[PDB]
Each structure stands twice: as C-alpha cells, then as structure tokens.
Symmetry: C2
Subunit: 332 residues, 2 copies
C-alpha cells in the first residue's frame, strides 16, 4: 500500500492545480461507478476544491434511481450532480476530469466532455485494454482490487479529515463494493475489508444498501421456476432448465445459475432455457473446480473459468441439453 499513499498526494496536487474537478464513470453507471465518483468528490471537498459528478436523467437506471431518491430526500448531495451540457459549459483548459471505473474512451459517460478535457485522471480496477484514455496526467489501475470504490476509499484515508465523508456518501461507496464483490464472495482481499471498515466507521448503512439492491417478486418466481428443475450428478454437475415453450429473461437464467451454487452438492451449474423463438440460452457457473469456460466454448460460446454462457440456434431445450451433456462427458 505504498502506492496508495503516493497516489493520494499526487492526486491532490493535480486536482488543486486545476480550476475545478469534473468526475465521470461509464455509460449506464452502476453503484461502483457512482460510489467511486462520490468518493472522488469527497476527496476534492476534503481539500476545499470544487467538484461535480456528470449524470443525466437518461443515465439513471432503476437501481441508481433508488439511490438518487434517497439522495434527494435525505441530503444535499444532489447539488454535486450535473448534466453533460452543464459540464461542458463549465469546463476550461484548466479543468481536471477524473474518469472512474472505466478506462476506454468509448465507454465514458460523455465522450465530448472527455475530449474537451486537457487534464485527465484515470482510476480503475481492470487491466489496461486496447482503447485507453489519452494522455492522462495520472493513471491508477489496480486489476486485483475489488472495485473502484475500494481504490478511492484508500485514497481518502491520507487526506485532511475536517470535511469528513458523510453517512450517505459512505453508504453508496459501500453499496458499490457490495455489488462488485457479490457481497464479499468475489475479488475480496484484506484491503477490501479495510475499505469496508473505513466506510462503516463513517456510517455506511448495510440496511439501506440491501434496500437499493432488492430483487422483485417476479424475478424470484421466474428464477425458482428454473432452480426447481435441477438435477445434480454425483460429480457435482447440476443441470436445470425451462420448458421448451417458455421464454426466460437472460438475466433470470444467469441468476438461476448463480443461485444453484449455494446448494449442497453442486460444483458447477448449467441452466438451459429458451431465449427467443429460435434461440436457446445457457448460463454456466462454478466454484472453481470445474471450468465452465471450456464447456461453453465447446458449445460455441465462452466466458471465464467460473462464469460462461452460450447461445444455440434453432434447437429445442431438450436438444441443447443433450449437446450440453455430450460436451460435459467429453470434458470431464
């Protein structure tokens, strides 16, 4: 964590050297993007700098809308959020733009604001890709961190404490970590917990966080409809499916596969369900022993060791299942 100290003070000099700070994450921002951004704006405010977060009404999905409702009703946080246009009008060549939770120009919330910026900072927890923000004054990329919220939280700890992180700000930063880690089950290191400690110390509300993230009744029902069918082999391979005649939401199929991993005896889950009139979807997950990337690549799809997917043209659910088992027996 030598890096966090140096980066925190280097960041503060860059931000203070400019006339003000404009913060953006990726398009259709999730709670890590928004929590990280909130975090940076608190970073700016601890040093009495002027900071805004770019967000348009059309960027606000249902999860984020629950966060924003809370922000409107219970603090003064809303004043920091500004539209693209207001962002544009307000920028000068001395304005520092900080990009959080992405590093590809084409994924940035507003690429025009990005292109107008002479001064850029990038903070993200993925590894550098093909595209990358051009000519940044400072790059803070940590592939092994849980989330951008975690990275930003660490930077806060080095800054003056007079203008402290508020309860609601820390709650959104916390929610972002919860989402990116699947409640501390993925990409969670001791430093993730260090960040969780700092945030909870500043009032991060675990109950409110749960509230932002509740699924609805229909999703639970559709999902359990898939789970109910599960057949678990002795080797820990579980297959579940929807009727050939029922269309399922792709996310519901993914969730079903996720949830089967919480059940006794299941090492790897495969959920098979109609996605379109002429397309069958499969989502696969595993706890690391069985490689589902391999299974799905054998069926013309792909992904990663623990989570992959494929889609099959012009087959019935029963045919897809048979193709799937053929692949499994071959692989295992």
């Amino acid at each position: 964590r030598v890096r966090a100290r140096v980066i925190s003070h280097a960041l503060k000099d860059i931000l203070a050297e400019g006339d003000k700070v404009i913060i953006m994450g990726h398009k259709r921002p999730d709670l890590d993007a928004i929590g990280a951004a909130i975090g940076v704006s608190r970073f700016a405010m601890m040093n009495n700098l002027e900071a805004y977060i770019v967000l348009n009404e059309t960027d606000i999905d249902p999860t984020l809308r629950r966060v924003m409702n809370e922000i409107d009703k219970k603090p003064e946080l809303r004043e920091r959020f500004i539209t693209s246009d207001d962002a544009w009008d307000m920028m000068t060549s001395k304005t520092t733009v900080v990009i959080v939770d992405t590093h590809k120009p084409e994924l940035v919330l507003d690429e025009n604001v990005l292109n107008k910026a002479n001064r850029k900072v990038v903070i993200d927890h993925h590894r550098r890709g093909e595209s990358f923000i051009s000519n940044p004054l400072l790059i803070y990329m940590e592939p092994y961190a849980s989330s951008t919220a975690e990275l930003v939280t660490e930077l806060l700890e080095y800054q003056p404490t007079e203008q402290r992180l508020t309860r609601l700000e820390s709650t959104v930063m916390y929610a972002g970590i919860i989402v990116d880690t699947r409640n501390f089950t993925l990409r969670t290191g001791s430093r993730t917990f260090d960040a969780a400690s700092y945030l909870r110390a500043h009032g991060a509300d675990t109950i409110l966080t749960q509230h932002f993230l509740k699924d609805d009744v229909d999703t639970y029902i559709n999902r359990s409809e898939l789970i109910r069918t599960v057949k678990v082999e002795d080797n820990g391979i579980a297959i579940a499916h929807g009727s050939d005649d029922k269309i399922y939401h792709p996310v519901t199929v993914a969730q079903a596969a996720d949830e089967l991993l919480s059940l006794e005896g299941i090492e790897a889950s495969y959920v098979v369900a109609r996605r379109e009139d002429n397309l069958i979807g499969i989502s696969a997950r595993s706890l690391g022993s069985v490689n589902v990337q391999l299974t799905m690549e054998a069926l013309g799809g792909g992904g990663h060791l623990t989570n992959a997917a494929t889609q099959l043209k012009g087959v019935t659910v029963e045919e897809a299942i048979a193709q799937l088992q053929q692949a499994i027996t071959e692989q295992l």
Copy 2:
C-alpha cells in the same frame, strides 16, 4: 488499546496455569468453534498446551462438514478432545476458557466447568442472570459481531512465528459470516477489521460457502411457499402452502424471512399447515409494520419484527381469512 491490554493479560493467565481447556456452548455453532480454534492458536503462539472440548454428540451437520476438513490436518485435529479426556487431564492449575457464552448452564460440559479452578470468559452477549463464577479475566463486548471477532483482536497482539493457518482462519471467518448473516447484522468497522486480518491469513470464501451450503430439498420447499406470495399496495405480503401439505416450522419461518429481501415488501405472513389439525403462521417485518400485534390478535405473539401463531382447527384458507381480518383491524 483495550484489546491490547486484554491480549497481554490473557497470555499471562494462560502461561501461568499448567495447560488450557477451551469450551463453547452446547450444540456449538461455527462461531463457538471458530473462537475456540482462535484461542487454541493464541495458546500455540506462546507455545502453550491447549485443547478444545468437543464430543461426537455435539457435532451437528454443519459442524461435521467443518470437521471433515479439520480431519485432514492432524496438528489441528489433535487439539479436539472429549469431555472425559478433558475432565481426566484437568488439574487445579488448568485454565478453562469459555467462549461465546457466559451462562454456566449453557456451557458445553458443566462438569468440566465445575471442575475448573481458573476461568476465563470471552463473549459478545449482554450479561444476564447466571454468570461464570470467579473468572480471572472477562472479555465481554455486547456490540461485537461474534466471539471470533473478539478473539481475532487478541491474536493481533501476540507473537507471529506460529501464525494462524489458512484452515483456522477459514473457520473463524465462517463464524463471523454465520453470526452476521454475511455482514448484514451486528456488523461494525471492527467486524471488518477482523475479517481483514483473517483474510490476510488465508480465510477461504469458497470453503466457507461449502460449509454453509443450503440443502436442495429445503430450498425447493421454501420457494414453493414464497412462490405464492401476494403483495398489497401497502407492502403487506401473504404467502401460503396448500391445505394438504405439512411444512416444517423452520421452513415456514425461513420463507417469511426471505420475503423481506424482496422489493416492496414491508411485512410478510406465511401460512402453512403444520399438523392434521394445526395451521402455523410466521410473521416478519422490516420494523415499521408491527406483526406482534397481528399475531397476538390471533392468539400468538413474539416481537415487533418477528412473531408467530398456531391456529387449531382451521384449514389454510380459513387461517388466511382470519389473518386478513386481523390485518384489516390492525390497520
């Protein structure tokens, strides 16, 4: 600095006696076992002789999954002994460390506790009526998530040549997971500090998940109930089992708990037959709607957020009608 003071005081007490006997509560859960394992690592860090009392009849199915892993590590497996062996090896200079409880009658083996001349108590519950007599040291903190969290703090101030192992860390961590329902309850910054320390010592999330796997049958029973839920505009939800199927009381309770995790639901009522002549209802609430009053109105009771009742002599449909009438009245 209080934990620092407790850590060092406890070390002198343990090194003063001839050996250490560690004991949790009857029917130990993962926090009681995790804490006990932590106290045994505490002892080994100072090259002291420590055992954990555990009888085969004290090992429920969750704990068995854990003991299956511990069996793979003889160094750790050998620390676990029966009540008989503990009693037999105890002396006037043996220190007994009671973890995760403070009531004599709740301790795993009261006979061992009664034979003990030197006692230490580490727990995270509010002190009540009966209490361990004449403790040399007491570490009680009703705000902590768990005893594992408490013991982790003590470990931090001890020599590190003989560190907490990956498996030991994992069990302690799983204890915190169970007691906080995955950082959702009774969880403070210090809880996360403990998690950080355990994780730095290799605490394994995937193994923890293995310990806490849910049975498939029961997931399927629970969801049969949930599937039926009907949610009113006021956030009141009612779910039911069919009139001809008996559900286990614990499954009904879990279903009621699970409904509160769904959007728009302020209070849940789950109605399922529990016998040939008895209908059960578990009621739960986020804390706004009072289900104690509803249940009391139906000849039951409990608490504001969590209550229940049993209705003799009605079908599920009648129980539902009567429940709605109570709900209407309350409103």
